[PDB]
Amino acid sequence: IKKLVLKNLNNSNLFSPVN
């Protein structure tokens, strides 16, 4: 999709293993 949305309020942590 071409329409960007910022949503910093909920991100997966890049710099971590998964739970």
Partner 1 sequence: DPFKLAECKLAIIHCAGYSDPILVQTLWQDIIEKELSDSVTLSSSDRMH
Q: Which of 9, 10, 14, 19 binds partner 1 (CB under 8 A)?
A: 14
> Does 11 contact partner 1 by CB under 8 A?
yes
The amino acid occupying position 17 is P
What is the residue whose two structure tokens read 């949503």?
Answer: 7
> Does 9 contact partner 1 by CB under 8 A?
no
Quick count: other Cβ atoms within 10 Å of Cβ 17? 5
Least distance in angstroms from the C-beta of 15 to partner 1: 7
Contact residues toward partner 1 (CB under 8 A) are 2-4, 8, 11-15
